[PDB]
Design a protein around this ligand. Sequence first.
Ligand SMILES: [Zn+2]
Ligand SMILES: [Zn+2]
Ligand SMILES: [Zn+2]
Ligand SMILES: [Zn+2]
Ligand SMILES: [Zn+2]
Lengths: 210, 215, 218
Amino acid sequence: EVQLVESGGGLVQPGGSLKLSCATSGFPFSNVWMHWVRQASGKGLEWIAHIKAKSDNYATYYAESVKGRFTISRDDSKTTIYLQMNSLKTEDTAVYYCTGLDYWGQGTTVTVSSASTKGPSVFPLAPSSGGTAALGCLVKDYFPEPVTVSWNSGALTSGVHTFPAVLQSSGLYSLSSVVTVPSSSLGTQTYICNVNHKPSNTKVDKKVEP
Amino acid sequence: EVQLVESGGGLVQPGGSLKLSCATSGFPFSNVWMHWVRQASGKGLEWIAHIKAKSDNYATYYAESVKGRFTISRDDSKTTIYLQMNSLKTEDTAVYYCTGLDYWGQGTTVTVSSASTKGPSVFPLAPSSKSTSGGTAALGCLVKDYFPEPVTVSWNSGALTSGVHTFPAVLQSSGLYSLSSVVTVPSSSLGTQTYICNVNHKPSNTKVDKKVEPK
Amino acid sequence: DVVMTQSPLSLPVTPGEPASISCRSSRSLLTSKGITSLYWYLQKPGQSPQLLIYRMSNLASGIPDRFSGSGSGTDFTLKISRVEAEDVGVYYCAQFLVYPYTFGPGTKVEIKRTVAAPSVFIFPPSDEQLKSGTASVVCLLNNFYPREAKVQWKVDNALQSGNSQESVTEQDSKDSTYSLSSTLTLSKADYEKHKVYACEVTHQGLSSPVTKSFNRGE
Ligand SMILES: [Zn+2]
Ligand SMILES: [Zn+2]
Ligand SMILES: [Zn+2]
Ligand SMILES: [Zn+2]
Ligand SMILES: [Zn+2]
């Protein structure tokens, strides 16, 4: 089973530094070439770096805009590649993927901003005989992205919409997560909003009651 | 969007009674025909009951296997149909679906047994490898000594699904179920991610979150 | 009382290749309006059934052109032109003309793929469980094909029998593999008497059995 798992993203001040990891498994690693590719929110894919294998003397190649700032490296004994990111700029804010160009990881989010981390407040959106009811939770005033929202520990996926976050005039994000259900199920089922904001160590479970 | 949601399943004595609901939404209800269909574990589909609409005088039809024991009904004002099950037999154990024969609900589980409810213990299956080993590590949770089925298992409140296997439960000699849920990850992923298995056993109102960490 | 039969009961197929599932009713399903009351469902692993074809030949909304249905009164055929890995599951015919309504027994579609040996993992009993008086040793076989597989438990090189149970997943809808869990269950006292715990795996993708093991207490 091929797996690529990036980690190490987070929030950093302009000019700061961060090291990303991409742990791999499921395939012989010694002669595989790998890349970092990033994607800003709502924008397209941008190739960042390429690293070859031991028999290529671990040759590396870089996008123009990261030369002299980023370093791609690999540790074959840990079957992992790395991206050391120095002199970070707000333009580096993005989801960073590692990829063989066939398989891709799920990405890790890097935010370069002078704003500090802020955990969200979570508020119920109370349910609104027969027919369709909607309910949700409002995840307000957090930084940076991302937040994870699930319902009933992931057992509830039908009818769920977790909307894109909006950036408010305060510099903080807000998002809503809603689910529609048949009204009669309001009396037979419990509905719990599971919110996780890793950058702030914020974990909130919120029961949304009629 | 069309939604069908069954509820009310659970554990009951032979001879006992239970009432299932199917709440619906997303469509005009007044002239739709609905059914209950059931499926025992590992087995095929068995049509159980059919109920027509108001203009059909709410006519009902039943499988011979349940006639005189189950009653299908509907409440148009709550856009809901019901299955009243009396004189339950062990053979009635199955997942019960509500369906229009195009759309189907997710199902609710009925278990007919003289045994009582028992919540699970949740034990960690520690990471196979360490973090500097490269390659693949496996970790999991063992969900043991529970009755009846079913149990829900998620990882990291549902955020983790890649690499997860939640296995069919086995019935132990003790008459209690056991299952395991595992996840594989790259070894170096260990010690950069936290792994929590979320276990819910509704019949016993057991909810358990178990952090699984390297030994 | 109307009997729905199906053939085959198991259908292995390589993706991209056609598949044909047949159904037979014990009486005609043609109505006075010229409708044939024959319906086809697919139930994917872990999911409720899904309508594919209604009244013998009509494609339900959302269903790809890959799927078609045909038939002659009491014999019917569900046809898949380019089978895809996502099509794994159990296919049912049904008649909704003569009460009591009836389903066929289901035909399980199996996607044929390249042989893939399992990756194998062994988990000792947790200290938490040991406190409860029992010891479960777990052996995981991951992402393998075909499904046939033999797990043998050995304690201090002694072959175990009658004290384990195992469970297999359905076939994966993406890579068409299986996984398997086997649990060896011992008294805590008997666990603490022995040193070497091993699960030995035999599979067509393995040139010789793989053994994963551990020594209790390191
Ligand atoms: Zn919706
Ligand atoms: Zn797997
Ligand atoms: Zn009869
Ligand atoms: Zn012994
Ligand atoms: Zn011994």
